[PDB]
């Protein structure tokens, strides 16, 4: 499923991400835009053989099991395929664990390079939330 901007914002807000660990909703929508273009089915292979999955491009080296990333951790205790569902619950619950681990949203390279320090509130402008 490819989300619209306000649709995803409303979905993330209902799942408790607005101001989660101090990150306003616009940060999460901005990260999703540049990580996956709002597409729950996005996958990208990394140089180390791991793969990023879903709307927030969660990495199989640490966070989910895809059966082909040797020596990887499964810290969200989920198959990576569950992160590709049109229901974002699994991706959001896993993202909450990632953003709480110490580095905040700097774990998402696209957020660091394209959202951090910008007017991220623009990403929820006009949405009925
Ligand atoms: Cl915001
Ligand atoms: Cl980037
Ligand atoms: Na959903």
Swiss-Prot record:
Subcellular location: Secreted
Tissue and organ distribution: In the egg white and polymorphonuclear leukocytes.
Binding locations of substrate: 101
EC top class named in words: hydrolase
Entries under InterPro entries matching the protein: Glyco_hydro_22 (IPR001916), Glyco_hydro_22_CS (IPR019799), Glyco_hydro_22_lys (IPR000974), Lysozyme-like_dom_sf (IPR023346)
Keyword Hydrolase: yes
GO BP field: cell wall macromolecule catabolic process; defense response to bacterium; defense response to Gram-negative bacterium; defense response to Gram-positive bacterium; killing of cells of another organism
Binding partners and assembly: Monomer.
Protein's UniProt name: Lysozyme C
């Amino acid at each position: 499923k490819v989300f619209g901007r306000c649709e995803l914002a409303a979905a993330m807000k209902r799942h408790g991400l607005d101001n989660y660990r101090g990150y306003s909703l616009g940060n999460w929508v901005c990260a999703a835009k540049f990580e996956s273009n709002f597409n729950t089915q996005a996958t990208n292979r990394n140089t180390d053989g791991s793969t990023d999955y879903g709307i927030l491009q969660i990495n199989s080296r640490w966070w989910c099991n895809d059966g082909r990333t040797p020596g990887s951790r499964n810290l969200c205790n989920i198959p990576c395929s569950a992160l590709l569902s049109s229901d974002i619950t699994a991706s959001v619950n896993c993202a909450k664990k990632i953003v709480s681990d110490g580095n905040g949203m700097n774990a998402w390279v696209a957020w660091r390079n394209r959202c951090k320090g910008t007017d991220v509130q623009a990403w929820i402008r006009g949405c009925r939330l």
